[PDB]
């Protein structure tokens, strides 16, 4: 028997309603963002980035000037979001590689052991594949987190930027220069209500391996989940692009809450996603409604409802407490379904505490039955038999946002000049993967004095022509830096010596299916490795030949199963200090000897 004191000490706590519990969280996220990204560093490096972008030969109407305040603010938000998303894809590709190496042991684990929990199955799989990260708990994920994967903090980016510059009936060059230095009040409000979320491959493996019975199914589920996440992130950047103020999540609680008759209302507005969630907790009954963030022609923020789980009254009267979600709409829906099923055997405190902790801190509940049901529902919502047809909603969100961009610009072009509207609503900042962007690569591998910077080429959500370039800054006055692009048939080595200037390496064309033809073979992604002595910064730039390249349909489970691409060749490296002239070119693996990918032999 127990006194009951330990049970109350491990009960979940409300992290949204408690004002002490909201202040503490907000501080840590702000501290985490400032440590990894400093406002002083980004502002000081503005000039270097501006010259890099201009040095890329971009046709008129398709080039970006970071001399404009709005263009600069959009770029740092874009670069931070892209870097975190890009890092996750490299982690996923590595994880897929380890699973494919040990498919025999993975298949045995998926078949023999099915009575264990989702977390236990994931831990066994991670140990077998010998992945870099072997912890599925929340603390382990936080501990093994890179600098770039830290979510971007809205108010930190928008801090100390001039707002509301007024010039009256002036077309002079100086007045234009002072106008461009400031930013509009709308963009400041958007940045104050913006927070990003980037889920880890370790968090995704639990939904992926909860019903899988084969390694191919487990790999396909992982790819299918991450295809949805990247599409949602692309929507998130586009939302800030148009001239509209984004809605931000809030909780409604009674003004004077009673002990025995208390109700809570949660309205989740995921900035990275096409759908929102409304959850109501009255008594022991939980009711949810999934609405569409597009449309909303009326004053009400909610659009049409696409999934019903009861009657939710959003017109309740009470105090309003505001928060930013650290989970996607799929994850929030997955938990609210499991909570609804298990509402009978959980208390009021457990229901509120489990819900608030997951939405605000991405903390999975400690209940084992609750966790298993949550991941089973998460798999269903991201599979082909989902109650929500995602491809329809993400497509409709894209059309709605482009329509808003056109009417917002045309509304301004009437109120002020074309030049004023252009500097306030750029047309070159459409979508996260559509836009021209840069990736500040980091490197921790040194082979014979050469630092290795890795980069993942693709996958592509748009089709057309793409260009890739590198900018290398090195302390030495004269250096020789090499770029190696690895495919399936072989790798391509190039040598350059120019410094402090962008240089195009690869010209690539991608078709409707999102697959390029790299030297006679269909590829879905490539690996780019850069070797430099004593480098200080290496940046990779990407741009599409045409502005606003058309979209490529998102791939579901059956699309990933149909085509299989080998990624094992991304692991091998080369030693530039031992390179020779005859070894510099496009060569295949049958030319090289076993283990030495540096000399042709």
């Amino acid at each position: 028997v127990a006194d009951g004191t330990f049970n109350s000490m491990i009960m979940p706590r409300a992290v949204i309603a408690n004002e002490r519990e909201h202040f503490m969280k907000t501080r840590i996220d702000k501290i985490e963002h400032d440590l990894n990204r400093s406002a002083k560093q980004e502002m000081m490096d503005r000039q270097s980035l501006a010259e890099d972008y201009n040095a890329l030969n971009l046709a008129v109407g398709q080039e970006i000037k970071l001399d404009i305040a709005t263009q600069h603010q959009l770029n740092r938000l874009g670069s931070a979001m892209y870097k975190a998303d890009h890092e996750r894809e490299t982690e996923l590709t590595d994880l897929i590689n380890r699973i494919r190496e040990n498919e025999v042991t993975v298949n045995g684990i998926l078949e023999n052991q099915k009575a264990i929990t989702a977390a236990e199955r994931a831990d066994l799989l991670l140990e077998v594949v010998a992945s870099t990260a072997k912890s599925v708990s929340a603390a382990g994920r936080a501990a093994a987190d890179g600098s770039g994967v830290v979510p971007v903090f809205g108010p930190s980016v928008a801090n100390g930027i001039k707002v509301g510059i007024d010039i009256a009936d002036s077309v002079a060059e100086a007045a234009i220069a002072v106008k461009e230095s400031g930013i509009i009040t709308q963009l400041n409000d958007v940045y104050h209500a913006f927070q990003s979320v980037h889920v880890a491959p370790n968090d995704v493996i639990k939904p992926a391996a909860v019903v899988a019975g084969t390694s191919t199914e487990l790999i396909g589920n992982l790819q299918a989940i991450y295809s949805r996440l990247r599409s949602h992130s692309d929507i998130g950047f586009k939302k800030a692009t148009v001239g509209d103020v984004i809605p931000n999540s809030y909780m409604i609680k009674p003004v004077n809450s009673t002990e025995y008759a208390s109700w809570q209302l949660y309205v989740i507005h995921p900035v990275q996603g096409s759908l929102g969630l409304v959850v109501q907790l009255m008594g022991d009954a939980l009711t949810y409604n999934v609405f569409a963030q597009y449309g909303n022609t009326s004053a009400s923020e909610f659009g049409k409802t696409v999934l019903t789980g009861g009657a939710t009254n959003t017109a309740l009267e009470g105090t309003k407490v505001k928060f930013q979600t650290k989970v996607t709409a799929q994850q929030a829906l997955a938990l609210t379904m499991a909570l609804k099923d298990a509402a009978s055997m959980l208390s009021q405190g457990e229901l509120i505490g489990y819900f608030e902790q997951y939405i605000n801190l991405a903390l999975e509940p400690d209940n084992l039955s609750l966790q298993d049901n949550m991941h089973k529902y998460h798999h269903l919502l991201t599979s082909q038999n989902s109650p929500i047809d995602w491809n329809y909603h993400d497509e409709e969100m894209h059309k709605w946002l482009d329509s808003r961009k056109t009417t917002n610009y045309d509304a301004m072009q009437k109120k002020d000049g074309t030049v004023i509207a252009d500097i306030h609503i750029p047309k070159v900042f459409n979508d996260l993967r559509n836009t021209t962007l840069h990736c500040k690569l980091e490197g921790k591998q040194t082979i014979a004095g050469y630092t290795v910077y890795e980069y993942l080429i693709g996958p592509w959500a748009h089709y057309g022509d793409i260009d890739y370039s590198v900018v290398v800054d090195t302390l030495n006055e004269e250096t020789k830096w090499y770029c190696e692009v690895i495919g399936i048939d072989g790798h391509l080595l190039i040598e350059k010596s120019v410094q402090h200037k962008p240089e195009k390496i690869l010209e690539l064309t991608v078709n409707d299916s999102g697959v390029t033809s790299f030297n006679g073979r269909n590829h879905d992604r490539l690996k780019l490795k850069v070797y430099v002595k004593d480098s200080l910064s290496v940046k990779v730039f990407r741009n599409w030949i045409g502005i606003n390249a058309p979209r490529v349909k998102t791939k579901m489970f059956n699309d990933h199963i149909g085509v299989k691409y080998d990624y094992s060749h991304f692991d091998k490296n080369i030693s530039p200090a031992h390179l020779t002239l005859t070894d510099l070119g496009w060569h295949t693996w049958d030319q090289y000897n076993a283990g030495n990918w540096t000399n042709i032999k």
């Binding site: 409604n289 696409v306 019903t308 038999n385």
Partner: protein
Amino acid sequence: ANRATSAFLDNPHPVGVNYVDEGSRQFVAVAELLASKLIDSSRESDESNSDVPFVQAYSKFADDNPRHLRVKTGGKMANALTNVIRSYYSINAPAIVPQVEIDRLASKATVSGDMYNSYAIFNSVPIVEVLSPARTTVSIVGSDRADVTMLNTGAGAANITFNFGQIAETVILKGSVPFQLARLNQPMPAARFTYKLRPLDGPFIVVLPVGNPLVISATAATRIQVPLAFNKALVESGFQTAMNDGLFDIQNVNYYSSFDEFIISQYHAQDGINRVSTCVILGLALQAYDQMRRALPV
């Protein structure tokens, strides 16, 4: 758009219009009561060594005494019961039995009841129409348990419209795999296995994913006012005997597998409220025909 309907719901033939008044209704009740006493007497005579109960029961039923040489036709009551069953089925039936003979036979006994004293539950499922898009295919098979097989071969998910009419009380839908169903112009819920619906709620939309076919099984319950002496087991067997004896071979009529299908088909038609009154009378007549024939086979 494609439309699929239940086979038994198509073109209910008009029902006869004679022998539906108070006096004729009393005759069917008396015939049912006297026939029940006949079959109960026949069992007792077989159980015992003497034939007194059957002799009295047949004398009351047939207005003459049984004979060892002549065949037991059932008397004028059997003849009148056979002909009124013919008239009830179709309007093209002769209906040449005199009304004075009906009143004479109705005076044999008295009944403390009517044809609206009670109710019965009928299990046929009405599927008035199933509306589907261009690419999907829908097949409806079954009357006691409808089985709707739908297959989608198009680009994306389609919407199938279900119309269960407005007469049935409850319809239970079960699916081979979980599926989504909702009322018209309403948000769709999460996928479940079984749904319970009220057909008067309105047309129901079903989400059909692309891939393996979905089979939905429907069971419905309808309530129809019947006399207290109604027995579905006896009526159903009487329906089969009437068909085999050829009491329903009339031109330009429809044929049904069970009395449950016959009464639901008539109810799901224009002026169907007036038709079920005659179908209930026909049902009670079939109850008397079953009991009379099983006691006096010919």
